[PDB]
Specification:
The PDB classes it as transferase. Keywords: Ubiquitin, Quality Control, E3 ligase, protein degradation, transferase. The entry is titled "Cryo-EM structure of human HUWE1". The protein: E3 ubiquitin-protein ligase HUWE1. This protein is mainly alpha-helical. The protein contains 6 helices and 2 strands. It has helices at 4-21, 31-38, 44-50, 52-61, 97-110, 114-127, and strands spanning 76-81, 84-89. Strand 1 and strand 2 (84-89) form a beta hairpin.
């Protein structure tokens, strides 16, 4: 849909209008999307539901030495957004991976939806103050 951001801004408006009316909607959004509307980071455990094999990759990075990978990785990942695939930077080491799993989960949640989210957040903050 070439206007999809506008529809996401409408539904963000509709969420904030439902909140304003004190009326319950049958929405059941992910914890990731609720965190984005709260301005909270996602957690790696959220990936378990969104991309189990990606959660498993991060869990193979956790509690294992990078030496178990047998090839190097860096803060860059191939991401499909809007059906275009592009390699995007995220900014590897024993110190960086702690952030990589956080940051890679940020990229995987928002990168493909960042513009829909920005429309939703404009619709939301239009009616319900962020703070």
């Amino acid at each position: 849909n070439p206007n999809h951001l506008s529809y996401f801004k409408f539904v963000g408006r509709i969420v904030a209008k439902a909140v304003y009316d004190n009326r319950l909607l049958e929405c059941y959004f992910t914890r990731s999307f609720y965190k984005h509307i709260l301005g909270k980071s996602v957690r790696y455990t959220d990936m378990e539901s969104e991309d189990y094999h990606f959660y498993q990759g991060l869990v193979y990075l956790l509690e294992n030495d990078v030496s178990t990978l047998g090839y190097d990785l860096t803060f860059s990942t191939e991401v499909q957004e809007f059906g275009v695939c592009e390699v995007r930077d995220l900014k590897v080491t024993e110190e960086n991976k702690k952030e990589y799993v956080h940051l890679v989960c940020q990229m995987r949640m928002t990168g493909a939806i960042r513009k829909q989210l920005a429309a939703f957040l404009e619709g939301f903050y239009e009616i319900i103050p962020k703070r």
